[PDB]
Amino acid sequence: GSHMGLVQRCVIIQKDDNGFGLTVSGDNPVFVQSVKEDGAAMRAGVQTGDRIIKVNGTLVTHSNHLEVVKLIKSGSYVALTVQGRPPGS
Protein backbone atom coordinates (compact mmCIF):
# COMPACT_ATOMS: atom_id res chain seq x y z
CA GLY A 1 0.00 0.00 0.00
CA SER A 2 1.12 3.54 0.85
CA HIS A 3 3.93 4.71 3.16
CA MET A 4 7.03 2.52 2.66
CA GLY A 5 10.21 2.18 4.70
CA LEU A 6 9.32 1.05 8.23
CA VAL A 7 6.00 -0.55 9.21
CA GLN A 8 4.83 -2.51 12.27
CA ARG A 9 2.95 -5.84 12.19
CA CYS A 10 1.54 -8.26 14.79
CA VAL A 11 2.38 -11.97 14.50
CA ILE A 12 0.22 -14.64 16.18
CA ILE A 13 2.28 -17.67 17.24
CA GLN A 14 0.63 -20.87 18.52
CA LYS A 15 2.14 -23.60 20.72
CA ASP A 16 2.85 -26.93 19.01
CA ASP A 17 4.56 -30.26 19.84
CA ASN A 18 7.93 -28.59 19.16
CA GLY A 19 6.84 -25.27 20.70
CA PHE A 20 7.27 -21.80 19.18
CA GLY A 21 10.74 -22.46 17.75
CA LEU A 22 12.12 -18.92 17.48
CA THR A 23 15.25 -17.03 18.57
CA VAL A 24 15.11 -13.41 19.76
CA SER A 25 17.54 -11.03 21.50
CA GLY A 26 17.74 -7.43 22.73
CA ASP A 27 15.58 -5.25 25.01
CA ASN A 28 12.94 -2.51 24.42
CA PRO A 29 13.23 -2.59 20.56
CA VAL A 30 13.72 -6.37 20.73
CA PHE A 31 15.12 -7.98 17.57
CA VAL A 32 14.24 -11.48 16.32
CA GLN A 33 17.30 -13.51 15.30
CA SER A 34 15.87 -16.60 13.56
CA VAL A 35 12.65 -18.65 13.31
CA LYS A 36 11.78 -22.32 12.74
CA GLU A 37 10.92 -22.62 9.03
CA ASP A 38 8.92 -25.76 9.88
CA GLY A 39 7.36 -24.52 13.13
CA ALA A 40 4.92 -22.07 14.72
CA ALA A 41 7.48 -19.30 14.19
CA MET A 42 7.39 -19.60 10.38
CA ARG A 43 3.77 -20.83 10.38
CA ALA A 44 2.74 -17.62 12.21
CA GLY A 45 4.43 -15.53 9.50
CA VAL A 46 7.69 -14.65 11.26
CA GLN A 47 10.88 -14.02 9.28
CA THR A 48 14.60 -14.04 10.13
CA GLY A 49 15.66 -10.62 11.40
CA ASP A 50 12.61 -8.77 12.75
CA ARG A 51 12.12 -5.91 15.24
CA ILE A 52 9.68 -7.09 17.93
CA ILE A 53 8.41 -4.08 19.89
CA LYS A 54 5.40 -5.57 21.75
CA VAL A 55 4.08 -8.99 22.84
CA ASN A 56 0.37 -9.63 23.54
CA GLY A 57 -0.09 -5.92 24.29
CA THR A 58 2.53 -5.98 27.06
CA LEU A 59 5.39 -3.85 25.73
CA VAL A 60 8.92 -5.25 26.02
CA THR A 61 10.15 -1.91 27.41
CA HIS A 62 9.38 -2.67 31.08
CA SER A 63 9.20 -6.43 31.73
CA ASN A 64 12.51 -8.16 32.57
CA HIS A 65 14.06 -11.12 30.72
CA LEU A 66 12.35 -13.90 32.72
CA GLU A 67 9.27 -11.63 32.86
CA VAL A 68 8.72 -11.52 29.08
CA VAL A 69 9.35 -15.28 28.91
CA LYS A 70 6.75 -15.99 31.62
CA LEU A 71 4.23 -13.78 29.80
CA ILE A 72 4.77 -15.51 26.44
CA LYS A 73 4.88 -18.96 28.08
CA SER A 74 1.67 -18.13 30.00
CA GLY A 75 -0.59 -19.24 27.15
CA SER A 76 -0.80 -21.55 24.13
CA TYR A 77 -0.71 -18.88 21.41
CA VAL A 78 0.30 -15.20 21.54
CA ALA A 79 0.49 -12.18 19.23
CA LEU A 80 3.71 -10.18 18.84
CA THR A 81 3.91 -6.60 17.55
CA VAL A 82 7.10 -6.40 15.47
CA GLN A 83 8.58 -4.16 12.76
CA GLY A 84 10.52 -4.85 9.57
CA ARG A 85 11.44 -3.50 6.13
CA PRO A 86 10.32 -4.13 2.50
CA PRO A 87 12.88 -6.51 0.88
CA GLY A 88 13.67 -5.08 -2.55
CA SER A 89 11.64 -1.87 -2.74
Binding site: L22, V24, S25, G26, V68, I72, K73
Partner: peptide
Protein backbone atom coordinates in the same frame (compact mmCIF):
# COMPACT_ATOMS: atom_id res chain seq x y z
CA UNK B 1 28.26 -8.71 25.41
CA UNK B 2 24.50 -9.34 25.63
CA UNK B 3 22.42 -10.15 28.73
CA UNK B 4 18.93 -9.93 27.18
CA UNK B 5 18.60 -12.91 24.79
CA UNK B 6 15.69 -15.38 24.86
CA UNK B 7 15.12 -18.50 22.74
CA UNK B 8 11.71 -20.23 22.69
Amino acid sequence: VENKVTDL
